[PDB]
Design a protein around this ligand. Structure first.
Ligand SMILES: CNc1ccc(Nc2ccccc2C(=O)O)c(-c2ccccc2)c1Cl
Length: 136
């Protein structure tokens, strides 16, 4: 297999900035204790591609999580805050667009390359949080 555009996401990433994440978690429905502990965390994100399968791992003092998926194909995901969601991830003009559905609710997580950073935008019902990662 040759190179793919999504190889731009591959690597080891560390959180360097976070904005409005507590308000995003509130809108998602995360409880007080989980919001406080999750808000302290500085995750490392490890992204790899093998054939059609993309794997995103998050390692932190709060939780270690991992998803593997094929673009456009729905999968089960247990989130760091212990939601059991149905997830679909697609590539839209270079942006990984991740929709999570649960309990009649929906949230969208976008992952984009900007300069040498990986920018994550989390959106729920008018509330956005921006989390910026740099290469580890
Ligand atoms: C609603 N709850 C919630 C939602 C998103 C989280 N994290 C991320 C998810 C996707 C892409 C990126 C991130 C990131 O963390 O940037 C976390 C979280 C996961 C691990 C540690 C801390 C928070 C939590 Cl709890």
């Amino acid at each position: 297999r040759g190179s793919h555009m999504c190889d731009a996401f591959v690597g080891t990433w560390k959180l360097v900035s976070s904005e409005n994440f507590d308000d995003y978690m509130k809108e998602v429905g995360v409880g007080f204790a989980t919001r406080k502990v999750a808000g302290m965390a500085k995750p490392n994100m490890i992204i790899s591609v093998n054939g059609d399968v993309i794997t995103i791992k998050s390692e932190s003092t709060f939780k270690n999580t991992e998803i593997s998926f094929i673009l456009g194909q729905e999968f089960d995901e247990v989130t760091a805050d212990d939601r059991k969601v149905k997830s679909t991830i697609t590539l839209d003009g270079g942006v990984l667009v991740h929709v999570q559905k649960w309990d009649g609710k929906s949230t969208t997580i976008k992952r984009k390359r900007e300069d040498d950073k990986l920018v994550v935008e989390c959106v729920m019902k008018g509330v956005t949080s921006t989390r910026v990662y740099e290469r580890a």
